[PDB]
Scaffold this active site. Structure first.
Site, PDB file in Angstrom:
ATOM      1  NE  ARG A 166      -4.290   4.970   0.439  1.00  0.00           N
ATOM      2  CZ  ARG A 166      -4.029   4.897  -0.860  1.00  0.00           C
ATOM      3  NH1 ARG A 166      -4.005   5.978  -1.623  1.00  0.00           N
ATOM      4  NH2 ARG A 166      -3.786   3.709  -1.407  1.00  0.00           N
ATOM      5  CG  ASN A 167      -0.479   4.118   3.873  1.00  0.00           C
ATOM      6  OD1 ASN A 167      -1.182   4.434   4.833  1.00  0.00           O
ATOM      7  ND2 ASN A 167      -0.758   3.082   3.093  1.00  0.00           N
ATOM      8  CG  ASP A 213       0.115  -0.320   5.993  1.00  0.00           C
ATOM      9  OD1 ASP A 213      -0.882   0.321   5.597  1.00  0.00           O
ATOM     10  OD2 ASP A 213       0.266  -1.540   5.772  1.00  0.00           O
ATOM     11  CG  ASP A 241      -2.124   0.987   1.033  1.00  0.00           C
ATOM     12  OD1 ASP A 241      -2.176   1.726   0.026  1.00  0.00           O
ATOM     13  OD2 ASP A 241      -2.974   1.040   1.947  1.00  0.00           O
TER      14      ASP A 241
HETATM   15  C1  LIG Z   1       0.701   5.258  16.200  1.00  0.00           C
HETATM   16  C2  LIG Z   1       1.000   4.544  14.909  1.00  0.00           C
HETATM   17  C3  LIG Z   1       0.742   3.181  14.781  1.00  0.00           C
HETATM   18  C4  LIG Z   1       0.956   2.509  13.594  1.00  0.00           C
HETATM   19  C5  LIG Z   1       1.455   3.181  12.489  1.00  0.00           C
HETATM   20  C6  LIG Z   1       1.993   2.500  11.271  1.00  0.00           C
HETATM   21  O1  LIG Z   1       2.763   3.083  10.516  1.00  0.00           O
HETATM   22  N1  LIG Z   1       1.671   1.195  11.132  1.00  0.00           N
HETATM   23  C7  LIG Z   1       2.301   0.255  10.279  1.00  0.00           C
HETATM   24  C8  LIG Z   1       3.442   0.602   9.559  1.00  0.00           C
HETATM   25  C9  LIG Z   1       4.073  -0.345   8.756  1.00  0.00           C
HETATM   26  C10 LIG Z   1       5.328   0.004   8.016  1.00  0.00           C
HETATM   27  F1  LIG Z   1       5.695  -0.961   7.174  1.00  0.00           F
HETATM   28  F2  LIG Z   1       5.207   1.109   7.281  1.00  0.00           F
HETATM   29  F3  LIG Z   1       6.369   0.200   8.824  1.00  0.00           F
HETATM   30  C11 LIG Z   1       3.550  -1.626   8.648  1.00  0.00           C
HETATM   31  C12 LIG Z   1       2.400  -1.964   9.350  1.00  0.00           C
HETATM   32  C13 LIG Z   1       1.759  -3.296   9.119  1.00  0.00           C
HETATM   33  F4  LIG Z   1       1.483  -3.501   7.834  1.00  0.00           F
HETATM   34  F5  LIG Z   1       2.531  -4.312   9.502  1.00  0.00           F
HETATM   35  F6  LIG Z   1       0.606  -3.428   9.770  1.00  0.00           F
HETATM   36  C14 LIG Z   1       1.792  -1.036  10.189  1.00  0.00           C
HETATM   37  C15 LIG Z   1       1.662   4.553  12.575  1.00  0.00           C
HETATM   38  C16 LIG Z   1       1.473   5.231  13.777  1.00  0.00           C
HETATM   39  N2  LIG Z   1       1.481   6.581  13.838  1.00  0.00           N
HETATM   40  C17 LIG Z   1       0.941   7.580  13.116  1.00  0.00           C
HETATM   41  N3  LIG Z   1      -0.208   7.306  12.487  1.00  0.00           N
HETATM   42  C18 LIG Z   1      -1.032   8.327  12.198  1.00  0.00           C
HETATM   43  C19 LIG Z   1      -2.381   7.963  11.707  1.00  0.00           C
HETATM   44  C20 LIG Z   1      -3.342   8.932  11.439  1.00  0.00           C
HETATM   45  C21 LIG Z   1      -4.605   8.559  11.015  1.00  0.00           C
HETATM   46  C22 LIG Z   1      -4.876   7.216  10.868  1.00  0.00           C
HETATM   47  N4  LIG Z   1      -3.978   6.256  11.113  1.00  0.00           N
HETATM   48  C23 LIG Z   1      -2.763   6.638  11.523  1.00  0.00           C
HETATM   49  N5  LIG Z   1      -0.777   9.632  12.404  1.00  0.00           N
HETATM   50  C24 LIG Z   1       0.414   9.879  12.957  1.00  0.00           C
HETATM   51  C25 LIG Z   1       1.341   8.924  13.359  1.00  0.00           C
HETATM   52  C26 LIG Z   1       2.458   9.676  13.801  1.00  0.00           C
HETATM   53  N6  LIG Z   1       2.234  10.961  13.680  1.00  0.00           N
HETATM   54  N7  LIG Z   1       0.980  11.095  13.166  1.00  0.00           N
HETATM   55  C27 LIG Z   1       0.404  12.399  12.921  1.00  0.00           C
END
Ligand SMILES: Cc1ccc(C(=O)Nc2cc(C(F)(F)F)cc(C(F)(F)F)c2)cc1Nc1nc(-c2cccnc2)nc2c1cnn2C
Length: 271
Positions: free
Chosen positions: A126-127, A140, A122
């Protein structure tokens, strides 16, 4: 992953919806984002994947709170939020150099994930989260896996959903997801950055996009886009995945343009 204890954690506001803005005590305190039964299983699960990542352009997992309620996944905070909304907001204010630097960062993170044999599936603006230094970090938010089927439905979604406009043809048609299909998605992200957040194939429906791509059509050049940049996205969109650049070729090519910036010159940057 590191088990955080809830006393070092203070939720403050709901950013989206749950994802809070909070403070994490480390003495000094740092700001963080805080995401809060199959849904519970996947929740703690995703943290285990995140914890395996440590790169400048990959959202950093500070830790988790898995032994108390609320259960929490804590990351660094990204002041400027999601890249797509952020570019639509700063439409035009960045030079090509600054936009290509964000793409370089994104590709650097994607090179790191590919080296881990992690396929994103993905990759889209947006990500991508942005911090006060315009550093871009792959994330993500999981929208691909949001469950909207009835709990008693005879037929249920399997394999989640795909972002049709960001997904390589082989992944749409045969569910063949590889770093090479992430590279296609990266191409779309380059177009997103260079247009400051336009919707891919904005004039077309979803079915018309799949028909357009199979007919050999691709997204058109962004306005003011240097030729080298549009050339690179086109390379990202080759139909045969094996002819696409690797995320290593990509980071390399961007680095060469940045170090010889005359190749990034576009008239709109002239003063
Ligand atoms: C707390 C948190 C938890 C999880 C993730 C995340 O990246 N999950 C993730 C990443 C990956 C990978 F591969 F990219 F590393 C793989 C996977 C997989 F696939 F394994 F599930 C999961 C991001 C955050 N933090 C944020 N998120 C949001 C936000 C806003 C609206 C809606 N949702 C999220 N706003 C934020 C922050 C930080 N600052 N701000 C303003």
């Amino acid at each position: 992953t590191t088990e955080i204890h809830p006393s070092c954690v203070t939720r403050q506001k709901v950013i989206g919806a749950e994802v809070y803005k909070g403070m994490l005590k480390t003495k000094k305190e740092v700001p963080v984002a805080i995401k809060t039964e199959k849904q519970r299983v996947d929740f703690l699960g995703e943290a285990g994947i995140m914890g395996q990542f440590s790169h400048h352009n990959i959202i950093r997992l500070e830790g988790v709170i898995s032994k108390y309620k609320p259960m929490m996944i804590i990351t660094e905070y990204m002041e400027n939020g999601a890249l797509d909304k952020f570019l639509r907001e700063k439409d035009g204010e960045f030079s090509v150099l600054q936009l290509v630097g964000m793409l370089r960062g994104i590709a650097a993170g994607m090179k790191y994930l590919a080296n881990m044999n992690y396929v994103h599936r993905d990759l889209a603006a947006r990500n991508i989260l942005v911090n006060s230094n315009l550093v871009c970090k792959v994330s993500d938010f999981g929208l691909s896996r949001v469950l909207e089927d009835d709990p008693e439905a005879t037929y249920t979604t399997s394999g989640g959903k795909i972002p049709i406009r960001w997904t390589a043809p082989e992944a749409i048609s045969y569910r063949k997801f590889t770093s090479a299909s992430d590279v296609w998605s990266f191409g779309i992200v380059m177009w997103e950055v260079m247009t400051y957040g336009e919707r891919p194939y904005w004039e077309l429906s979803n079915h018309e996009v799949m028909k357009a791509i199979n007919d050999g059509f691709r997204l058109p050049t962004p306005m003011d886009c240097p030729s080298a940049i549009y050339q690179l996205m086109m390379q990202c969109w080759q139909q045969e995945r094996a002819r696409r650049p690797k995320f290593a070729d990509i980071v390399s090519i961007l680095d060469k343009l940045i170090r010889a910036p005359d190749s990034l010159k576009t008239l709109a940057d002239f003063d």
